[PDB]
Amino acid sequence: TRFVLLDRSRPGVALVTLNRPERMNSMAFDVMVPLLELLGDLRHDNSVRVVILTGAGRGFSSGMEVLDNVILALRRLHQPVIAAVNGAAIGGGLCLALACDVRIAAHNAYFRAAGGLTASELGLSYLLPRAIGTSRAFEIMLTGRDVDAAEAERIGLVSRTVPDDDLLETCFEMAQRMRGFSRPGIELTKRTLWSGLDAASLEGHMQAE
Amino acid sequence: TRFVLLDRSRPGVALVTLNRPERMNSMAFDVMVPLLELLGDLRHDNSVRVVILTGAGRGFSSGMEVLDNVILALRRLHQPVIAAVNGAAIGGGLCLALACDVRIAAHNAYFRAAGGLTASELGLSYLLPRAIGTSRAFEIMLTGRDVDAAEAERIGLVSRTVPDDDLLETCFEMAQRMRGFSRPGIELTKRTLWSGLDAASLEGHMQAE
Amino acid sequence: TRFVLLDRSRPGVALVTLNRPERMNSMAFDVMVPLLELLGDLRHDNSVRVVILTGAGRGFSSGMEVLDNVILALRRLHQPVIAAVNGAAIGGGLCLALACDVRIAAHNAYFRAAGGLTASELGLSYLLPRAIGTSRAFEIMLTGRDVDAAEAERIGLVSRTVPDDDLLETCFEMAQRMRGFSRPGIELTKRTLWSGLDAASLEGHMQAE
């Protein structure tokens, strides 16, 4: 009945579930705003070392902009965010997954860019070519085709694709491994990675303080 | 007898053929300048939704700079450009293909960087690592080796590799699919993609107007 | 007994061996400083066309910063540098390999990011996502897992993976091929490639002089 659920069962992990499976967790206002407030809170929760983000039901997400705020909130966390893509990641849903630090896909997952200049398409146009190279990003976005989970793994859109039944535990297993590193160590890795993408030059980035 | 041919057989599509098969469509002045003027015209033709670019004969192209003007003209089109790489794409020819939005290769195609600071090598050095990653771009350009069509598909230099006999119709099939999207929608996708490559940061790009 | 060895057996090639196999050629001060001085000398040696960099013993390298100076010295050479990754490339060792122009791996090799804001992690965070895309770079660096030589080749972290016994000769064969191009031609290719990575835009890069 809540639009975004939080699960703190596992030590050091916050499992966040987009919860309107009826509408394929479409990123309407009443989903993205509570998500934004939760992401803000999680930033200050030092018991949480890793965030796993997933969708209730059949889809991950079918996707006055709040998506850009959410994207930057994900990036602002000192915790790594693992997207557990359990089903359809479409438009804003694909962009949300690309805003996470790691993606793992269920066999059931597929990915589509879709949709008017939106935060979603701007985010996609920045992040997708940097994930999978310009050739594949360009034709996927220009044809608007579906990318299945096997292809997503092959081309490096996700890190791994696993049986639907194994998805969350794979993510929990990865989170558990990440817990073994120090909180400031992991944070620095995440921060250098995202700022490395924006860096003007190699030398400038190496001079970062 | 014309050095660049235009074919408007298929609705919404302009098939452009580099036509000096004798010299493997080498990007001499008398080819690139008519191509440049045609690309300028196509920009204003609202009957054309998609451009397919290919070479006459055995090669795609064997490649006071006009290549840079052509590169920027391709990019300036609101229409997606599909390179139908039917054979040898060498030097300026590879750079021309990389300046298109999507590449499809015939079984017959192969790719080589070749050649004096040229627009070709500058364009390549920017575009190839962004297409296929720095490791592969660097050694392909530093060894100057041939890359066959099967490898090109594997590493994401092209989106697909198909039988020689099926090349153009695969491209027409993709163009036909792209026609289904609105003209301003497709345009925005192409524009965000190319400007995304040049963007200084994620956040700056998301603030684009 | 020297910490960095130079081998000029093969014409046009300088084979540089990191020589403290006892400590897995860890990039301590007494290794990196002589390497830095050697890289400086090699820059002025016009008999040397290609540099091959490798490690003595079982590892490539297990890795007040001098690593950043070494990184920029490698990049400053007009000669291509081929990393012959003969074993463990860990932390600064992986970053060193990523600072070379081409990587070839022995069957024996594996790669790990490891480690406090260091030149190593900054260099990695810039170079790894540009080599293999953000999805794989991010999870490899955030999980700190080992990447074996077969995977490294598959994802384009290295150009090729070969039997341990064949590693150096594969590199010598590639160097021999690179020798066939002119010294200023090869130099320009290397320079456009590295500056292309830092370029602000396609058009700006094409206007380079």
XYZ file of C-alpha atoms in Angstrom:
627
model
C 0.000 0.000 0.000
C 3.089 2.215 0.338
C 4.492 3.252 -3.061
C 8.127 2.655 -2.017
C 9.029 -0.099 0.462
C 12.156 -0.386 2.601
C 13.517 -3.714 3.809
C 16.292 -3.790 6.401
C 16.267 -7.567 7.004
C 19.866 -8.137 5.974
C 22.667 -6.501 7.979
C 24.251 -3.487 6.284
C 21.756 -3.598 3.406
C 18.722 -1.513 2.458
C 16.487 -3.264 -0.073
C 14.271 -0.645 -1.720
C 11.261 -1.843 -3.661
C 9.315 0.323 -6.098
C 5.809 -0.689 -5.136
C 3.077 -0.122 -7.643
C 3.260 -3.432 -9.556
C -0.206 -2.685 -10.960
C 1.214 0.090 -13.174
C 4.584 -1.626 -13.687
C 6.058 0.805 -11.115
C 5.744 3.676 -13.580
C 7.736 6.613 -12.328
C 4.817 8.848 -11.548
C 5.062 11.648 -9.037
C 3.740 9.612 -6.094
C 6.524 7.059 -6.565
C 9.503 9.280 -7.349
C 8.950 11.784 -4.538
C 8.824 9.197 -1.722
C 11.836 7.501 -3.361
C 13.640 10.835 -3.330
C 12.889 11.382 0.372
C 13.989 7.817 1.186
C 17.245 8.216 -0.769
C 17.875 11.380 1.245
C 17.357 9.537 4.526
C 19.499 6.554 3.476
C 22.378 8.947 2.925
C 22.459 9.671 6.657
C 21.928 6.076 7.826
C 25.363 4.726 8.703
C 23.931 1.261 9.400
C 23.287 0.963 5.660
C 26.378 0.015 3.627
C 24.734 -1.001 0.345
C 21.423 -0.225 -1.340
C 19.605 -2.736 -3.534
C 16.899 -1.187 -5.729
C 14.208 -3.333 -7.353
C 10.597 -3.370 -8.505
C 7.545 -5.163 -7.132
C 5.756 -7.627 -9.396
C 6.483 -8.318 -13.059
C 8.394 -5.138 -13.900
C 11.371 -3.156 -12.653
C 9.830 0.116 -13.896
C 7.938 1.232 -17.025
C 9.099 4.822 -16.435
C 8.396 19.318 -13.402
C 11.146 16.679 -13.432
C 11.893 14.717 -10.277
C 13.733 11.906 -12.089
C 16.822 14.087 -12.348
C 16.688 14.722 -8.574
C 16.439 10.974 -7.956
C 19.362 10.313 -10.350
C 21.568 12.788 -8.493
C 20.373 11.448 -5.072
C 21.430 7.902 -6.098
C 24.810 9.237 -7.168
C 25.145 11.255 -3.916
C 24.863 8.203 -1.649
C 28.190 7.056 -0.245
C 26.691 3.544 -0.510
C 26.837 1.563 -3.747
C 23.422 1.026 -5.280
C 22.736 -2.278 -7.004
C 19.824 -2.297 -9.406
C 18.067 -5.677 -9.257
C 16.287 -5.504 -12.603
C 13.486 -8.015 -12.117
C 11.514 -7.182 -15.247
C 10.723 -4.408 -17.730
C 13.042 -1.400 -17.511
C 11.550 1.079 -19.952
C 12.282 4.754 -20.576
C 12.690 6.368 -17.179
C 13.012 2.825 -15.820
C 16.123 2.132 -17.910
C 17.519 5.526 -16.961
C 16.905 4.747 -13.269
C 18.844 1.471 -13.611
C 21.680 3.297 -15.406
C 21.821 5.767 -12.502
C 22.618 2.901 -10.095
C 26.239 1.772 -9.651
C 25.755 -1.910 -10.587
C 22.999 -3.718 -12.525
C 22.003 -7.386 -12.223
C 19.206 -8.760 -14.391
C 16.676 -11.514 -13.979
C 16.152 -13.835 -16.940
C 12.754 -12.058 -17.111
C 14.220 -8.557 -17.542
C 14.348 -6.555 -20.760
C 15.395 -2.984 -21.499
C 13.984 -0.299 -23.788
C 14.558 3.410 -24.276
C 11.170 5.140 -24.738
C 8.912 8.184 -24.197
C 9.437 16.364 -25.420
C 12.942 16.762 -23.997
C 12.925 14.774 -20.753
C 15.405 14.110 -17.939
C 15.006 10.485 -18.883
C 16.253 10.870 -22.432
C 19.022 13.287 -21.409
C 20.204 10.907 -18.683
C 20.034 7.983 -21.112
C 21.913 9.836 -23.825
C 24.736 10.537 -21.383
C 24.860 7.252 -19.518
C 24.034 4.559 -22.075
C 26.888 5.265 -24.533
C 29.324 5.390 -21.626
C 28.074 1.956 -20.444
C 27.958 0.055 -23.722
C 29.724 2.232 -26.295
C 28.221 4.595 -28.854
C 27.395 2.090 -31.612
C 25.041 0.014 -29.483
C 23.683 2.931 -27.447
C 22.847 4.867 -30.613
C 20.990 2.097 -32.423
C 19.157 0.898 -29.298
C 17.932 4.425 -28.668
C 17.208 5.229 -32.338
C 15.327 1.967 -33.095
C 13.659 1.884 -29.682
C 13.959 -1.912 -29.703
C 13.770 -4.271 -26.697
C 17.061 -5.575 -25.358
C 16.639 -8.954 -23.615
C 18.565 -9.938 -20.468
C 20.976 -12.249 -22.264
C 21.952 -9.475 -24.696
C 22.158 -6.926 -21.888
C 24.772 -9.065 -20.167
C 26.653 -9.781 -23.408
C 27.067 -6.090 -24.312
C 27.737 -4.982 -20.709
C 24.466 -3.177 -20.046
C 24.276 -5.351 -16.924
C 27.061 -7.166 -15.040
C 25.247 -10.487 -14.819
C 21.986 -12.131 -15.771
C 20.562 -14.824 -13.462
C 17.387 -16.942 -13.035
C 14.392 -14.889 -11.802
C 14.392 -16.915 -8.569
C 18.048 -16.126 -7.908
C 17.997 -12.360 -8.577
C 17.727 -10.844 -5.087
C 20.066 -13.317 -3.433
C 22.708 -12.645 -6.095
C 22.393 -8.964 -5.218
C 22.493 -9.681 -1.483
C 25.594 -11.819 -2.070
C 27.277 -8.922 -3.900
C 26.199 -6.437 -1.209
C 27.609 -8.809 1.423
C 30.944 -8.801 -0.408
C 30.953 -4.983 -0.654
C 30.310 -4.792 3.136
C 33.753 -6.276 3.677
C 35.411 -3.066 2.485
C 35.548 0.005 4.698
C 32.776 2.577 4.420
C 35.150 5.434 3.516
C 37.067 3.178 1.114
C 33.956 2.158 -0.824
C 32.717 5.756 -0.804
C 35.930 7.016 -2.353
C 35.723 4.362 -5.034
C 32.143 5.348 -5.926
C 32.984 9.066 -5.855
C 36.096 8.763 -8.049
C 34.139 6.637 -10.525
C 31.268 9.101 -11.023
C 33.540 12.174 -11.063
C 35.911 10.316 -13.429
C 33.096 10.221 -15.985
C 32.804 14.024 -15.880
C 36.541 14.652 -15.678
C 37.953 17.072 -18.245
C 41.262 15.159 -18.622
C 43.292 12.279 -17.178
C 45.833 14.627 -15.636
C 43.216 16.943 -14.154
C 41.451 13.938 -12.591
C 44.688 12.615 -11.096
C 45.192 16.040 -9.476
C 41.838 15.737 -7.651
C 41.753 16.485 -3.889
C 28.593 8.587 -64.106
C 27.601 10.826 -61.180
C 30.038 10.527 -58.252
C 27.255 10.441 -55.624
C 23.876 8.848 -56.396
C 20.554 9.452 -54.655
C 17.791 6.855 -54.550
C 14.342 7.820 -53.285
C 12.577 4.551 -54.200
C 11.500 3.706 -50.669
C 9.097 6.033 -48.838
C 10.742 8.212 -46.190
C 14.227 6.972 -47.111
C 17.152 8.483 -49.008
C 19.672 5.862 -50.125
C 22.957 7.620 -50.903
C 25.557 5.718 -52.874
C 29.197 6.763 -53.135
C 29.746 6.122 -56.813
C 33.273 5.644 -57.997
C 33.607 1.861 -57.523
C 36.652 1.953 -59.815
C 38.714 3.713 -57.119
C 36.937 1.996 -54.210
C 34.979 5.247 -53.668
C 38.105 6.967 -52.367
C 37.142 10.197 -50.694
C 38.665 12.503 -53.241
C 37.470 16.049 -53.691
C 35.023 15.252 -56.507
C 33.205 12.766 -54.270
C 33.176 14.583 -50.935
C 32.017 17.953 -52.269
C 28.914 16.620 -54.068
C 28.226 14.490 -50.965
C 28.478 17.623 -48.846
C 26.024 19.514 -51.076
C 23.624 16.545 -51.061
C 23.790 16.239 -47.258
C 22.936 19.942 -47.087
C 19.898 19.466 -49.316
C 18.709 16.350 -47.454
C 18.598 18.413 -44.284
C 15.784 20.496 -45.767
C 13.864 17.600 -47.349
C 11.054 16.750 -44.946
C 9.991 13.778 -47.087
C 13.226 12.076 -46.025
C 13.074 10.490 -42.555
C 16.170 8.277 -42.694
C 19.380 8.292 -44.720
C 21.168 5.103 -45.747
C 24.765 5.654 -46.886
C 26.632 3.000 -48.876
C 29.275 2.459 -51.537
C 29.009 1.260 -55.130
C 30.856 -1.912 -56.092
C 33.240 -3.923 -53.925
C 34.093 -1.260 -51.345
C 32.339 1.103 -48.963
C 35.197 3.632 -49.221
C 39.015 3.444 -49.296
C 39.207 7.013 -47.950
C 42.030 21.563 -47.542
C 39.842 19.162 -45.547
C 36.261 18.554 -46.627
C 35.892 15.304 -44.661
C 35.372 17.285 -41.472
C 32.596 19.298 -43.177
C 30.935 16.057 -44.290
C 31.255 14.598 -40.757
C 29.542 17.634 -39.245
C 26.884 17.663 -42.049
C 26.002 14.015 -41.244
C 25.711 14.912 -37.575
C 23.605 18.017 -38.406
C 20.862 16.043 -40.172
C 17.747 15.578 -38.068
C 17.479 12.198 -39.844
C 19.355 9.143 -38.590
C 22.044 7.999 -40.992
C 22.640 4.275 -41.366
C 25.968 3.293 -42.850
C 25.533 0.187 -45.017
C 29.152 -0.954 -45.052
C 29.238 -3.149 -48.144
C 32.999 -3.600 -48.336
C 36.334 -1.987 -47.462
C 36.075 0.925 -45.028
C 39.609 2.266 -44.836
C 41.019 5.446 -43.309
C 38.624 8.233 -44.208
C 36.161 5.474 -45.117
C 36.133 4.103 -41.561
C 35.856 7.631 -40.201
C 32.893 8.294 -42.524
C 31.127 5.171 -41.206
C 31.850 6.238 -37.609
C 30.274 9.624 -38.381
C 26.966 7.898 -39.231
C 24.494 7.091 -36.435
C 24.227 3.321 -37.046
C 26.495 0.861 -38.896
C 25.475 -2.440 -40.510
C 28.096 -4.586 -42.222
C 28.031 -7.029 -45.083
C 29.887 -10.307 -44.598
C 32.253 -8.793 -47.214
C 33.097 -5.688 -45.157
C 36.325 -5.050 -43.272
C 37.643 -2.003 -41.433
C 41.085 -0.412 -41.205
C 42.471 2.847 -39.872
C 45.052 4.207 -42.356
C 46.729 7.186 -44.081
C 50.260 14.304 -41.726
C 47.571 15.279 -39.218
C 44.273 14.666 -41.015
C 40.584 15.164 -40.207
C 40.303 11.444 -40.731
C 42.713 10.483 -37.981
C 41.388 13.161 -35.609
C 37.805 12.012 -36.184
C 38.856 8.384 -35.726
C 40.788 9.110 -32.554
C 37.702 10.737 -31.053
C 35.013 8.405 -32.321
C 36.559 4.930 -32.344
C 37.429 4.710 -28.618
C 33.954 5.972 -27.760
C 32.423 3.216 -29.953
C 34.484 0.215 -28.898
C 36.468 1.292 -25.836
C 40.064 2.481 -25.620
C 41.838 -0.897 -25.522
C 40.528 -2.059 -28.886
C 40.522 1.384 -30.512
C 44.146 1.962 -29.508
C 45.553 -1.323 -30.784
C 43.488 -1.286 -33.992
C 44.765 2.192 -34.771
C 48.357 1.534 -33.630
C 48.755 -1.808 -35.479
C 46.758 -0.627 -38.489
C 45.338 -4.142 -38.840
C 42.188 -5.192 -40.742
C 39.089 -5.828 -38.666
C 36.726 -8.305 -40.374
C 32.923 -7.987 -40.255
C 32.439 -10.758 -37.712
C 34.889 -9.092 -35.307
C 33.385 -5.666 -35.965
C 30.015 -6.944 -34.792
C 31.498 -8.795 -31.805
C 33.291 -5.713 -30.428
C 30.432 -3.312 -31.272
C 32.071 -1.455 -34.146
C 28.891 -2.289 -36.070
C 25.418 -3.203 -34.768
C 24.972 -6.228 -37.007
C 26.738 -8.173 -39.715
C 24.628 -9.821 -42.446
C 25.076 -11.682 -45.775
C 26.206 -9.374 -48.621
C 22.897 -10.026 -50.404
C 20.886 -8.974 -47.358
C 22.737 -5.742 -46.483
C 20.556 -3.025 -48.035
C 17.256 -4.642 -47.129
C 18.381 -4.976 -43.504
C 19.077 -1.243 -43.568
C 15.760 -0.493 -45.273
C 14.026 -2.632 -42.637
C 15.693 -0.610 -39.861
C 14.876 2.687 -41.606
C 11.262 1.514 -41.937
C 11.156 0.894 -38.185
C 12.653 4.336 -37.438
C 9.956 5.933 -39.670
C 7.368 4.831 -37.132
C 8.638 7.384 -34.613
C 7.828 11.066 -34.980
C 10.253 13.287 -36.867
C 10.826 15.635 -33.905
C 11.088 12.677 -31.515
C 13.794 10.939 -33.548
C 15.596 14.252 -34.053
C 15.747 14.895 -30.329
C 17.112 11.421 -29.745
C 19.880 11.926 -32.329
C 20.689 15.410 -31.010
C 20.877 14.362 -27.342
C 23.091 11.419 -28.301
C 25.705 13.455 -30.195
C 25.702 16.328 -27.675
C 25.853 13.760 -24.837
C 29.234 12.650 -26.180
C 30.585 16.204 -25.857
C 28.853 16.936 -22.562
C 31.083 18.231 -19.772
C 29.157 16.384 -17.010
C 26.037 14.304 -16.349
C 24.377 17.110 -14.421
C 25.214 19.763 -17.003
C 23.766 17.538 -19.749
C 20.559 16.943 -17.793
C 20.175 20.735 -17.512
C 20.194 21.079 -21.328
C 17.442 23.192 -22.966
C 69.798 -7.149 -8.831
C 68.664 -3.990 -10.646
C 65.028 -3.111 -9.867
C 64.199 -2.252 -13.505
C 65.893 -4.085 -16.389
C 66.274 -2.932 -19.989
C 66.621 -5.350 -22.891
C 67.572 -4.046 -26.329
C 68.041 -7.452 -28.008
C 65.407 -6.920 -30.677
C 65.864 -4.121 -33.225
C 63.678 -1.070 -32.609
C 62.337 -2.498 -29.339
C 62.993 -1.759 -25.669
C 61.802 -4.559 -23.386
C 61.463 -3.162 -19.862
C 61.171 -5.616 -17.007
C 60.001 -4.677 -13.519
C 62.500 -6.650 -11.494
C 61.612 -7.471 -7.943
C 59.778 -10.786 -8.485
C 60.214 -11.508 -4.766
C 57.646 -8.819 -3.874
C 55.552 -9.343 -7.022
C 57.157 -6.167 -8.450
C 55.198 -4.023 -6.004
C 55.404 -0.419 -7.068
C 57.527 0.782 -4.209
C 59.671 3.870 -4.473
C 62.848 2.020 -5.492
C 61.055 0.529 -8.501
C 58.988 3.472 -9.723
C 61.771 6.063 -9.589
C 64.254 4.089 -11.727
C 61.343 3.277 -14.074
C 60.575 6.983 -14.287
C 64.197 7.842 -15.132
C 64.317 5.052 -17.736
C 61.053 6.211 -19.346
C 62.585 9.685 -19.563
C 65.678 8.343 -21.312
C 63.675 6.139 -23.703
C 61.864 9.246 -24.882
C 65.119 10.557 -26.348
C 66.329 7.241 -27.802
C 65.433 7.308 -31.488
C 66.661 3.727 -31.951
C 63.677 2.616 -29.865
C 60.397 2.459 -31.815
C 58.278 0.418 -29.397
C 58.392 -0.271 -25.666
C 57.283 -3.576 -24.159
C 56.676 -3.426 -20.398
C 56.492 -6.599 -18.302
C 57.202 -8.054 -14.876
C 59.830 -10.528 -13.696
C 58.646 -13.791 -12.164
C 55.067 -14.786 -11.372
C 53.479 -11.329 -11.340
C 53.192 -8.275 -13.561
C 52.900 -5.977 -10.518
C 51.075 -6.104 -7.161
C 51.110 -2.287 -7.008
C 54.395 11.388 -2.316
C 53.005 9.878 -5.528
C 55.381 8.836 -8.290
C 52.856 6.565 -10.030
C 51.197 9.594 -11.591
C 54.590 10.757 -12.935
C 55.178 7.305 -14.428
C 51.667 7.296 -15.971
C 52.295 10.645 -17.655
C 55.844 9.560 -18.728
C 54.369 6.470 -20.465
C 51.842 8.682 -22.218
C 54.579 11.200 -23.184
C 56.645 8.652 -25.127
C 56.269 8.956 -28.884
C 56.682 5.151 -28.880
C 53.730 2.834 -28.296
C 54.002 0.920 -25.045
C 52.749 -2.656 -24.966
C 52.028 -4.062 -21.539
C 52.932 -7.765 -21.461
C 50.844 -8.762 -18.453
C 52.559 -11.962 -17.352
C 50.766 -12.378 -14.037
C 49.016 -10.489 -11.233
C 48.162 -6.878 -12.073
C 46.777 -5.495 -8.832
C 45.952 -1.947 -7.755
C 48.774 0.246 -8.998
C 49.744 -2.700 -11.208
C 46.410 -2.624 -13.053
C 46.644 1.149 -13.325
C 50.165 0.826 -14.778
C 48.875 -1.601 -17.434
C 45.981 0.762 -18.236
C 48.514 3.573 -18.717
C 50.192 1.589 -21.526
C 48.832 1.852 -25.085
C 48.169 -1.874 -25.666
C 47.745 -4.807 -23.249
C 48.414 -8.492 -23.965
C 47.817 -11.075 -21.247
C 49.332 -14.418 -20.424
C 46.935 -17.233 -19.550
C 48.441 -16.775 -16.049
C 47.432 -13.106 -15.719
C 44.583 -11.739 -13.623
C 43.504 -8.198 -12.788
C 42.218 -6.572 -9.605
C 41.589 -3.023 -8.448
C 42.833 -2.654 -4.842
C 44.446 -0.517 -2.105
C 43.281 7.031 1.112
C 42.867 8.829 -2.214
C 45.686 7.517 -4.407
C 46.962 8.212 -7.928
C 46.252 4.566 -8.553
C 42.546 4.763 -7.826
C 42.171 8.113 -9.613
C 43.955 6.762 -12.693
C 41.845 3.598 -12.572
C 38.601 5.508 -12.177
C 39.413 7.520 -15.293
C 40.928 4.829 -17.472
C 39.023 1.635 -16.675
C 35.516 2.857 -17.617
C 36.909 4.282 -20.847
C 38.477 0.872 -21.663
C 35.615 -1.467 -20.818
C 32.555 0.727 -20.271
C 31.070 1.980 -17.013
C 28.992 -1.074 -16.055
C 31.945 -3.448 -15.888
C 34.439 -0.876 -14.598
C 32.094 0.110 -11.769
C 31.335 -3.386 -10.501
C 34.932 -4.605 -10.871
C 36.140 -1.655 -8.828
C 33.277 -1.763 -6.292
C 33.444 -5.547 -5.662
C 37.238 -5.632 -5.873
C 37.002 -9.046 -7.542
C 39.687 -10.799 -9.629
C 39.268 -10.663 -13.388
C 40.933 -13.648 -15.106
C 42.760 -13.383 -18.448
C 39.987 -14.996 -20.470
C 37.438 -12.496 -19.122
C 39.857 -9.604 -19.584
C 40.079 -10.409 -23.281
C 36.320 -10.963 -23.622
C 35.401 -7.555 -22.156
C 38.268 -5.708 -23.895
C 40.447 -5.044 -20.861
C 43.239 -6.606 -22.929
C 43.529 -7.027 -26.715
C 44.524 -10.683 -26.601
C 45.211 -13.473 -24.155
C 47.867 -16.072 -25.055
C 49.716 -19.044 -23.476
C 52.268 -17.963 -20.827
C 55.070 -19.306 -23.042
C 53.921 -17.219 -26.002
C 53.432 -13.861 -24.236
C 56.656 -11.976 -25.009
C 56.945 -13.195 -28.580
C 53.358 -12.111 -29.272
C 54.351 -8.666 -28.018
C 57.571 -8.682 -30.045
C 55.534 -9.699 -33.102
C 53.180 -6.745 -32.549
C 56.107 -4.369 -31.942
C 57.700 -5.651 -35.161
C 54.500 -4.807 -37.039
C 54.355 -1.311 -35.492
C 57.995 -0.730 -36.598
C 56.798 -0.840 -40.191
C 55.022 2.501 -39.784
C 56.962 5.753 -39.726
C 58.091 7.143 -36.384
C 56.219 10.448 -36.821
C 53.150 8.619 -38.150
C 52.912 6.295 -35.147
C 53.591 9.205 -32.792
C 50.722 11.212 -34.223
C 48.413 8.244 -33.858
C 49.357 7.788 -30.184
C 49.091 11.528 -29.491
C 45.673 11.948 -31.143
C 44.389 8.905 -29.252
C 45.371 10.125 -25.771
C 44.311 13.737 -26.431
C 41.065 12.436 -27.994
C 40.160 10.968 -24.603
C 40.466 14.406 -22.976
C 38.874 16.295 -25.855
C 35.991 18.593 -24.933
C 34.043 17.890 -28.167
C 34.287 16.154 -31.548
C 34.475 19.448 -33.409
C 37.072 20.942 -31.079
C 39.228 17.817 -31.487
C 38.971 17.942 -35.279
C 40.220 21.551 -35.118
C 43.419 20.426 -33.334
C 46.780 21.709 -34.669
